Every structure is written in structure tokens, then in C-alpha cells.
CSV table of C-alpha atoms and ligand atoms in Angstrom, one decimal:
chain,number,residue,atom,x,y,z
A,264,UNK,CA,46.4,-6.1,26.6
A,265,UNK,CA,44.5,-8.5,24.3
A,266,UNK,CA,41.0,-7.7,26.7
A,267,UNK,CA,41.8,-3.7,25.8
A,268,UNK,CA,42.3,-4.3,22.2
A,269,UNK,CA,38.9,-6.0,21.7
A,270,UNK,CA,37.3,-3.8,23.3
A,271,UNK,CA,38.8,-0.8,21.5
A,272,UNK,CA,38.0,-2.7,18.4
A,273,UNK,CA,34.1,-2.5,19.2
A,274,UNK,CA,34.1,0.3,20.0
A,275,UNK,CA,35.6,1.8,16.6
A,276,UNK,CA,32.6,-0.6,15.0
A,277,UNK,CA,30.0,1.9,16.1
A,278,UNK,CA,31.8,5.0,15.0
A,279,UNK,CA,32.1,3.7,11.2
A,280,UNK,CA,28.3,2.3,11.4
A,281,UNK,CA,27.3,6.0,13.4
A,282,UNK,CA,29.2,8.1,10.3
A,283,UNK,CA,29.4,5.9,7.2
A,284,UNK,CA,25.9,5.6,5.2
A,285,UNK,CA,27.8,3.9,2.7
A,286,UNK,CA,28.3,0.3,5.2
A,287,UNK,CA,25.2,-0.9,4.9
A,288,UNK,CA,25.3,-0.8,0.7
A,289,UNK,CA,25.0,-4.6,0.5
A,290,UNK,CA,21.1,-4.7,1.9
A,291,UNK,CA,20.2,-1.1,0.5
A,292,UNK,CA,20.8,-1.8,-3.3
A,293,UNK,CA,18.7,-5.4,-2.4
A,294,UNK,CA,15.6,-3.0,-1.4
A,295,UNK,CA,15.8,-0.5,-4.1
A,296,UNK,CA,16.0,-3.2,-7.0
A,297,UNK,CA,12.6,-4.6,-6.0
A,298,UNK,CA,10.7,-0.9,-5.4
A,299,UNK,CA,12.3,-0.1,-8.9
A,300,UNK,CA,11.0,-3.2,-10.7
A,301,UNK,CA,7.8,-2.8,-9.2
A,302,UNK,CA,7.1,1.0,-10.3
A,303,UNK,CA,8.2,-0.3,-13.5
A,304,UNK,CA,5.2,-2.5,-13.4
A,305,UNK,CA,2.8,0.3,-12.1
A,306,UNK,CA,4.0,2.4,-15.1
A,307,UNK,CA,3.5,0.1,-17.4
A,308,UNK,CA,-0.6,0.5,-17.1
A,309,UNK,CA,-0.3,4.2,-18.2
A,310,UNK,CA,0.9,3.0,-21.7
A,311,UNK,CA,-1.5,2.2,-24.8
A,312,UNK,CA,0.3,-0.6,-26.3
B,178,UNK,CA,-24.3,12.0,-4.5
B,179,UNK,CA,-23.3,9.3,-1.7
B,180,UNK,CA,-20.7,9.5,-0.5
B,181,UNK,CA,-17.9,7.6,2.3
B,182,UNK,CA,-19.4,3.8,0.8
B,183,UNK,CA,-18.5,1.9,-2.1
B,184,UNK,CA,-20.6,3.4,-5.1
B,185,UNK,CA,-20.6,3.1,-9.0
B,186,UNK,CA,-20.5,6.7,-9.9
B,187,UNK,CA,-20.5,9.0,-13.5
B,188,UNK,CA,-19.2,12.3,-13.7
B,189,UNK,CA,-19.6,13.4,-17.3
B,190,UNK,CA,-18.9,11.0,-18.8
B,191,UNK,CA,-16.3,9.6,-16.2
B,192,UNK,CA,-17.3,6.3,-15.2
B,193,UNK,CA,-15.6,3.9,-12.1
B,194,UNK,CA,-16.4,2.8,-8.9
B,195,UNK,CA,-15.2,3.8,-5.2
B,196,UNK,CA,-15.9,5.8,-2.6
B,197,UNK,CA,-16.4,9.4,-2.4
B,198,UNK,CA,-14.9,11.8,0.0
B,199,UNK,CA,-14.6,15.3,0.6
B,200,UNK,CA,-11.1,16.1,0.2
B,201,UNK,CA,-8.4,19.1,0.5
B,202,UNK,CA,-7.0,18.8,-2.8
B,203,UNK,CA,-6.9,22.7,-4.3
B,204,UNK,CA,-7.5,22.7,-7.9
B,205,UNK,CA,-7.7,25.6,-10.2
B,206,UNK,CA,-10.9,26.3,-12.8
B,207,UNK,CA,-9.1,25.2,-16.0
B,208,UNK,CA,-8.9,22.0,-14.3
B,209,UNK,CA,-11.4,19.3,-13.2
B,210,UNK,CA,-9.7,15.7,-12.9
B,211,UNK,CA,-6.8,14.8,-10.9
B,212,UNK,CA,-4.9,11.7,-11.5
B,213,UNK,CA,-2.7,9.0,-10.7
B,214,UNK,CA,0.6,8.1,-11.2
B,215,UNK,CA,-0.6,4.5,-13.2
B,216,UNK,CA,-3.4,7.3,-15.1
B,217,UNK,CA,-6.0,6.5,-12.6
B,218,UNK,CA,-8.3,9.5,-11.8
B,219,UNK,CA,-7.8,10.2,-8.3
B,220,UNK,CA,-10.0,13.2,-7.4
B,221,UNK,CA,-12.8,14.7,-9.6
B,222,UNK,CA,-14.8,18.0,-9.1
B,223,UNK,CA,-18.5,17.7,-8.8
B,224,UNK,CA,-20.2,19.4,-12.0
B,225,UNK,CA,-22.8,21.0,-10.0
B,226,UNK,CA,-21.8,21.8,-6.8
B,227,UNK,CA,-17.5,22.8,-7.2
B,228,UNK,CA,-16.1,20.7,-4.2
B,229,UNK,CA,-13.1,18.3,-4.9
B,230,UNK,CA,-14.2,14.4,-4.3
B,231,UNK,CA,-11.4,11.8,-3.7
B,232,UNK,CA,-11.6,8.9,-5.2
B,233,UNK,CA,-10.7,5.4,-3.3
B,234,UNK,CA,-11.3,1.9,-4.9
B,235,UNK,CA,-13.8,-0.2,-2.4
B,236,UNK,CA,-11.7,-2.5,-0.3
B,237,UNK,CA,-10.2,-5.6,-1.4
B,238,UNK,CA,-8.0,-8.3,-0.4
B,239,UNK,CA,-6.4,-11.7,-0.8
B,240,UNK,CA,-8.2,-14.5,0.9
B,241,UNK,CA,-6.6,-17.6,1.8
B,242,UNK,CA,-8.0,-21.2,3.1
B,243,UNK,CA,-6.1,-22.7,6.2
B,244,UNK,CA,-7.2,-26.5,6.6
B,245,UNK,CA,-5.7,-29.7,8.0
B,246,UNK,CA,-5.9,-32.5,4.7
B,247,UNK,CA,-8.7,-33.9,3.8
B,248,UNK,CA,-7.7,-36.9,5.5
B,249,UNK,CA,-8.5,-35.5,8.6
B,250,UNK,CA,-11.1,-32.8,8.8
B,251,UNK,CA,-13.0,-31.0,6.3
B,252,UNK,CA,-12.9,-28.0,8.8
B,253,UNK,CA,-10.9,-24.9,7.6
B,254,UNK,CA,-10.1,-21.8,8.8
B,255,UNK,CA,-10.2,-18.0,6.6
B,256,UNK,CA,-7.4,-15.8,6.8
B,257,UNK,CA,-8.5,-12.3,4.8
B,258,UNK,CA,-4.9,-10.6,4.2
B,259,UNK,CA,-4.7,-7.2,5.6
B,260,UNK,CA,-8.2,-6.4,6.0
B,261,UNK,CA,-9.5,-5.8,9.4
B,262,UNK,CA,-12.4,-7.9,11.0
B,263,UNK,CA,-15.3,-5.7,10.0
B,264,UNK,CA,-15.2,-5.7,6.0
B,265,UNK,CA,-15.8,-9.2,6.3
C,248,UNK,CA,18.2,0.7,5.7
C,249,UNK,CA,15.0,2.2,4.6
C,250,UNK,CA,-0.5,-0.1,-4.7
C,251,UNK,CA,-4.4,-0.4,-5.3
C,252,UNK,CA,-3.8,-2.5,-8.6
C,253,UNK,CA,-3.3,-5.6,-7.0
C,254,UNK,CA,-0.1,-5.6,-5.9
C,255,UNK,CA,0.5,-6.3,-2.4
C,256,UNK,CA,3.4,-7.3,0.3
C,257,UNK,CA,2.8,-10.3,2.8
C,258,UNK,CA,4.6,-10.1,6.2
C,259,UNK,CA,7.5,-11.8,7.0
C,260,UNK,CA,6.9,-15.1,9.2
C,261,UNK,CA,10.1,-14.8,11.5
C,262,UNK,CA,9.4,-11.2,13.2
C,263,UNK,CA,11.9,-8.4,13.6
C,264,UNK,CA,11.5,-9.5,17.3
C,265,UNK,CA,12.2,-13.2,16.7
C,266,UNK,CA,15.2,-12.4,14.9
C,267,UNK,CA,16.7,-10.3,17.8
C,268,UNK,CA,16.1,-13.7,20.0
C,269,UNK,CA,17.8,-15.9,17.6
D,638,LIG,C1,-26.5,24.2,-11.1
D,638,LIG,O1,-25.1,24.4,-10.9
D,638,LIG,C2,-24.8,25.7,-10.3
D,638,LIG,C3,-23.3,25.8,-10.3
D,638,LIG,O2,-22.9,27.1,-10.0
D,638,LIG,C4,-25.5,25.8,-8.9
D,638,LIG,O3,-25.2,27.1,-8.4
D,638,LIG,C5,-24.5,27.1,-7.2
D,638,LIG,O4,-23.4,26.2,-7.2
D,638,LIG,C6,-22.6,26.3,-6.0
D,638,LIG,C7,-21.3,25.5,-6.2
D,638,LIG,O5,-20.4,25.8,-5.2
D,638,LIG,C8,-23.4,25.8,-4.8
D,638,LIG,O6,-23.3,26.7,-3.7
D,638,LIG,C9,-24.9,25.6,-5.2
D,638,LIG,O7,-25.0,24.4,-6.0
D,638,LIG,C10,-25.4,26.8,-6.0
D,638,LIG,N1,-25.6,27.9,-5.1
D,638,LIG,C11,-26.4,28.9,-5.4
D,638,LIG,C12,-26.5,30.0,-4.4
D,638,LIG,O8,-27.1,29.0,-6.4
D,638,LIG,C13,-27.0,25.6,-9.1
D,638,LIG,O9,-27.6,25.6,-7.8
D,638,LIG,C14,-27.3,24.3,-9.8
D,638,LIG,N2,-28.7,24.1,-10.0
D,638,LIG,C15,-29.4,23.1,-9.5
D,638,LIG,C16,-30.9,23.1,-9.8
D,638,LIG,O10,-28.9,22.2,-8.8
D,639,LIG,C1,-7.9,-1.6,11.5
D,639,LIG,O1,-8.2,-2.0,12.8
D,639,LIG,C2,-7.3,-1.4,13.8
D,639,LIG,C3,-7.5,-2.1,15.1
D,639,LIG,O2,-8.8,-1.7,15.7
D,639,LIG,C4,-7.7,0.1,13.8
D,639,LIG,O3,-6.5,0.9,13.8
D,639,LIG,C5,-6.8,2.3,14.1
D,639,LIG,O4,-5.6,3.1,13.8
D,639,LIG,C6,-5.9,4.5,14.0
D,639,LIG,C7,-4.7,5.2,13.5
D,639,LIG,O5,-3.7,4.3,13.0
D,639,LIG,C8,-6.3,4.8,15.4
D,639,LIG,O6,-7.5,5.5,15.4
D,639,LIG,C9,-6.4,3.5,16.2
D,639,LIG,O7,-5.1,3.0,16.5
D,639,LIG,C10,-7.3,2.4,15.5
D,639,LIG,N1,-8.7,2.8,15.6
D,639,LIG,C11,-9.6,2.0,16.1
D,639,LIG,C12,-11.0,2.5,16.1
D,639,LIG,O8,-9.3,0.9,16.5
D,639,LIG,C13,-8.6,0.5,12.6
D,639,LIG,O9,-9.9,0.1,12.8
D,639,LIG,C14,-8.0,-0.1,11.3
D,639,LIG,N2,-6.7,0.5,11.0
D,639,LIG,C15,-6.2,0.4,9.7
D,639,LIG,C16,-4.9,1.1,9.5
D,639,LIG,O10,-6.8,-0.1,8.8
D,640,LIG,C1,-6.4,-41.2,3.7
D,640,LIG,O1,-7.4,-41.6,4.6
D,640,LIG,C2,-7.7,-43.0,4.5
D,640,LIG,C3,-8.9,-43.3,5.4
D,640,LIG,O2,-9.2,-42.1,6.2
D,640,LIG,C4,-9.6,-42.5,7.5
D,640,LIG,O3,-10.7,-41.7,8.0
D,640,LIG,C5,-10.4,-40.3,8.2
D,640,LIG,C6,-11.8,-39.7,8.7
D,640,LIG,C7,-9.3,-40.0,9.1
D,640,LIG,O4,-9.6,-40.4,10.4
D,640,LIG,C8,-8.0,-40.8,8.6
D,640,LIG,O5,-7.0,-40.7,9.6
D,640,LIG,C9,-8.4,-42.3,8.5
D,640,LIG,O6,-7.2,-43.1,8.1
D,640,LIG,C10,-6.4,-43.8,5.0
D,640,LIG,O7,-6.7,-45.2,4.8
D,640,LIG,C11,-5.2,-43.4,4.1
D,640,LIG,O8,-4.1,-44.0,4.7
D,640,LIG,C12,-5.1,-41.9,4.2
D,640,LIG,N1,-4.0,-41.5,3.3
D,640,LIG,C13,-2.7,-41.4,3.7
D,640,LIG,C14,-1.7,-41.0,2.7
D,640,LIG,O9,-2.4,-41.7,4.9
């Protein structure tokens, strides 16, 4: 019983992951915040100051 | 006009330096410079002869020394960050 | 989980590969 619980409860792992975009929001938001600081960088040459 | 090596060219006025391609870029007559995102120009038309040039800066790159102290060699070894081994 | 003004991005040391193995 325990042995066919596990397993059942794996299994359900890869349907949230397979479905849900939202899971992963932790590492996504780290990745964005550093391409959005940088184009705020690149930007920054087109101003006259 | 050379073009495909690094070269310091001036188009009217225009003045930089980088390479010049042909390129597929379709621009209309009103218009003769593209541009950048940061305001760089990017592609220009030549004045003469009306095919678009693309504009890419000559090739650059960090370089970094790789040695062993000083108190035990004064041999070092150059890593040139993503570049290839023939701009060297 | 998805430029020519100087501004560049150095490779990580441990490689997606290595990290599989660890
Ligand atoms: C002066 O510029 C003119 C631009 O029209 C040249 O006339 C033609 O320009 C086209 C541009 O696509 C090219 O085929 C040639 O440069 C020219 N072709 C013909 C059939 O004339 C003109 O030749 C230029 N004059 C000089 C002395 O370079
Ligand atoms: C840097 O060197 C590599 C290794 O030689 C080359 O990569 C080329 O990549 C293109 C398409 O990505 C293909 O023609 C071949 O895989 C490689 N060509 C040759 C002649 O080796 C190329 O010289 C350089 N590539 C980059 C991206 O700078
Ligand atoms: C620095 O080096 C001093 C003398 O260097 C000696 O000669 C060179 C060619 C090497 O072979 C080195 O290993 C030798 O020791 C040392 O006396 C001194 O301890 C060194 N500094 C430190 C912090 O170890």
C-alpha cells in the first residue's frame, strides 16, 4: 500500500509540472529581473542627459 | 567602398567604424538610416549606389591572464573570452 | 524556464551536464 502511494504521488508530480507554467515562478521572475535591469542600462545611452 | 573587414567609414556626414555588408533590410526612399535600439545606426544606404549596408562593430572581447604566482613561474597563459582562435 | 556595448555574460563553471551528475 505505502509502495503504491509513492509511486502514485510521482506520478501526479509530472502532471502539475506538464500543465502548470505557473510552478516554476520562483526561478522565472530571478531571470527576468536581470534582462530587465540590463535593457534599462542599454536604454539609458539613447538619452541626452 | 570595402566591405566584410573592419573599416572607418563616412556616409554624409555619418561617421563610425565596422564592417560593411550587403544586407536584406527593405527600406523606403524617404528613408536612409536605420537604427538601433540604444540609437546606434545599424544599416545605412549607400549615397551613390542605393543598396542597404549593415553595419557591425569590429570584434572585441575581454582578455584575461591565467598564471601560477610569481613565486613560481612568470609563465602565463591568455584566455580571449568568446572570441574564436583566429581574431587573435 | 527561458549587447555590442560592452556588456557581456561569462559561462557558468559547473556545466548543465555536471549538475545532472551531482
Ligand atoms: C551617381 O549616382 C547615381 C545614383 O543614381 C548613379 O546612377 C546609378 O545608380 C545606381 C544605383 O542603384 C547604380 O546602378 C549605378 O551607380 C548607376 N547606374 C547607372 C546606369 O547610371 C551614377 O552612376 C553615379 N555616378 C558616378 C560617376 O558614380
Ligand atoms: C567560431 O568557431 C566555430 C568552431 O569552428 C565555428 O562555428 C561555426 O558555426 C556555424 C553555424 O553555427 C557552422 O558553419 C559551423 O558549426 C562552424 N563553422 C566552422 C567553419 O567551423 C565558427 O568558426 C565560429 N562560430 C561562431 C558562432 O562564432
Ligand atoms: C616567495 O618566494 C621566495 C623565494 O622564491 C624561491 O624561488 C622561486 C623561483 C620559487 O622556486 C619559490 O618556490 C622559491 O621559494 C620564498 O622564500 C618565499 O617563501 C615565497 N613566498 C611565500 C609566501 O611563500
Amino acid at each position: 500500500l505505502i509502495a503504491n502511494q509513492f509511486n502514485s504521488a510521482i506520478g501526479k508530480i509530472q502532471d502539475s509540472l506538464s500543465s502548470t507554467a505557473s510552478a516554476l515562478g520562483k526561478l522565472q521572475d530571478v531571470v527576468n529581473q536581470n534582462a530587465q535591469a540590463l535593457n534599462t542600462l542599454v536604454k539609458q545611452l539613447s538619452s541626452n542627459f | 567602398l570595402v566591405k566584410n573587414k573592419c573599416v572607418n567609414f563616412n556616409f554624409n556626414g555619418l561617421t563610425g567604424t565596422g564592417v560593411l555588408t550587403e544586407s536584406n533590410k527593405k527600406f523606403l526612399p524617404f528613408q536612409q538610416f536605420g537604427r538601433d535600439i540604444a540609437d546606434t545606426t545599424d544599416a545605412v544606404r549607400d549615397p551613390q549606389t542605393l543598396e542597404i549596408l549593415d553595419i557591425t562593430p569590429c570584434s572585441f572581447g575581454g582578455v584575461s591572464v591565467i598564471t601560477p604566482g610569481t613565486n613560481t613561474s612568470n609563465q602565463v597563459a591568455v584566455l580571449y573570452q568568446d572570441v574564436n582562435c583566429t581574431e587573435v | 524556464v527561458t549587447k555590442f556595448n560592452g556588456l557581456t555574460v561569462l559561462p557558468p563553471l559547473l556545466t548543465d551536464e555536471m549538475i545532472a551528475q551531482y
